[PDB]
Amino acid sequence: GHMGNAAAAKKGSEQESVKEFLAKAKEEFLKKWESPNTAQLDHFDRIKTLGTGSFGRVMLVKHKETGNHYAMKILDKQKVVKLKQIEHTLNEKRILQAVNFPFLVKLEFSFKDNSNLYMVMEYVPGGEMFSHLRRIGRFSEPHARFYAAQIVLTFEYLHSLDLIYRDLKPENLLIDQQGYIQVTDFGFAKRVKGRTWTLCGTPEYLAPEIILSKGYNKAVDWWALGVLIYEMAAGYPPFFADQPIQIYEKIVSGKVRFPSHFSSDLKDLLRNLLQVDLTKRFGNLKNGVNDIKNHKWFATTDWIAIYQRKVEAPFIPKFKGPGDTSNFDDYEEEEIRVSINEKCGKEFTEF
């Protein structure tokens, strides 16, 4: 066969150890999910806006008593209600409180006041993967593989907790000071033992079964991994067009084209992740995640060493001081106004 006796026993043992880790990870998550005003605004100095979404914005802040820097996600409660994202917001906080994994951002504090909700998490200073990818053009296959392997492990972890992530893209991936990935946004993540049906995600990264309004499962995350690996290695995604509807037609078509510089191993991995047929998609078969981790394209990946953050990263972002923001774009600074009247108090009681 492909493995001799020594490699075969080593791999089996490694896979078993993953099971034991994940079982313990699940019991820790569930304990924390079942039993979670950890600070206040005056405890931080607001430095600079790091990013904005429909919710509000993310600001670099310095915790005054300790001098530590953090990223503070500020959500305007009235905007959240108008956007119909109450459940998404409470769910994101609950996930962030309960998970623990080296590539998942760590929530330090959370609190709320009359007008806003606050999530204070570790500041990830190296910038968005998106910027780095667009600047560099494309990542070499070893560089893309280093990032991919972190997503594989992160999804292996999240899926064992029955969490589907559903919004993988370079825009949602931050680079930390050691060059490793951090995932921060969980606004579309959901606990899904079986199927779910919500149309959500980002056009270029949608699995065909979402587009086709089917009940779908965690395998949509493995399709999105295919799209991510493709985009990292090519510099552009496999399916693009002027308008989303044309992107969708391409996704569901079963056709994908590859750059001529893609290795054969990469193309084979991608044909099996970007597989429209669920009965054949890697990550969705009897062998589970092992079909991906054991694939030839990942043969040089030492999965434990990636997890332990013992692999030297191919790229280490520019790092000056602890509150340096040079790896982030400039955003327009809007003041954080706090109404004298409580807004949407009932909707956010649990936050």
Binding site: R134, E171, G187, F188, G201, T202, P203, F240, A241, D242
Partner: peptide
């Protein structure tokens, strides 16, 4: 080229969720 086509799509910047 495919890259040129990507540029022509106009979806080269940060993409929003639906």
């Amino acid at each position: 080229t495919t890259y040129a086509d990507f540029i022509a799509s106009g979806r080269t910047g940060r993409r929003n969720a639906i």
